[PDB]
């Protein structure tokens, strides 16, 4: 355990030994903290067209999309449950692009475990809840999978207050 690069997360609520949560927006948090790692809720093509991915890419002035396209040219598509490490641009040192399953499109919810397992390669991460939004997974379930799978330190930014309250209630009541 060392100080390393300062990840100045403020106002988080500790849910478990290693999972923290804040009612906040991930882009705002990244700009204020400039964490070592920000997680993107990616798709297999790294096409950052909406949701968290679109917001992160916009905050980088499209640099993230340009870099992602170059990576996909070398790699081909990611797999569901997989990830890649690219630059964090002006938001973080690194961006961990993680593909959770899109159950709204018929993909396997069990791969949410694989998706969160990628976080264990990083000591500390700023992240959204995976497979939310258009990906269609139950957010309470996604938080549970996160808690049960991630063993490194994860700081979750959940912007919607009602959802945040629902998630925190699943742990305090």
UniProtKB/Swiss-Prot annotation:
Regarding the membrane, this protein is recorded as: Multi-pass membrane protein
The Macro domain, residue ranges:
6-173
The reactions it catalyses are: Thiol-dependent hydrolysis of ester, thioester, amide, peptide and isopeptide bonds formed by the C-terminal Gly of ubiquitin (a 76-residue protein attached to proteins as an intracellular targeting signal)
The gene designation is rep
Localization (cell):
Host endoplasmic reticulum membrane
**Subunit structure as annotated in this protein's UniProt entry:** May form homohexamers. Interacts with N protein.
The identity of this protein, by name, is: Papain-like protease nsp3
Job description of the protein: Responsible for the cleavages located at the N-terminus of the replicase polyprotein. Participates together with nsp4 in the assembly of virally-induced cytoplasmic double-membrane vesicles necessary for viral replication. Antagonizes innate immune induction of type I interferon by blocking the phosphorylation, dimerization and subsequent nuclear translocation of host IRF3. Also prevents host NF-kappa-B signaling. In addition, PL-PRO possesses a deubiquitinating/deISGylating activity and processes both 'Lys-48'- and 'Lys-63'-linked polyubiquitin chains from cellular substrates.
Instruction: State the activity regulation.
Output: Inhibited in vitro by GRL-0617.
């Amino acid at each position: 355990s060392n100080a390393g690069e300062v990840n100045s997360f403020s106002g988080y609520l500790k849910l478990t030994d290693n999972v923290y949560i804040k009612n906040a927006d991930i882009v705002e948090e990244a700009k204020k903290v400039k964490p070592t790692v920000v997680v993107n809720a990616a798709n297999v093509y790294l096409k950052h067209g909406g949701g968290v991915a679109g917001a992160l890419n916009k905050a980088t002035n499209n640099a993230m999309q340009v870099e992602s396209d170059d990576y996909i040219a070398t790699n081909g598509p990611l797999k569901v449950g997989g990830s890649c490490v690219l630059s964090g641009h002006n938001l973080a040192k690194h961006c961990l692009h993680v593909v959770g399953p899109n159950v709204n499109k018929g993909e396997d919810i069990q791969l949410l475990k694989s998706a969160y397992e990628n976080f264990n390669q990083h000591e500390v991460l700023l992240a959204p809840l995976l497979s939310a939004g258009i990906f269609g997974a139950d957010p309470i379930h996604s938080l549970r999978v996160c808690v049960d799978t991630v063993r490194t330190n994860v700081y979750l930014a959940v912007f919607d207050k009602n959802l945040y309250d629902k998630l925190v209630s699943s742990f305090l009541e």
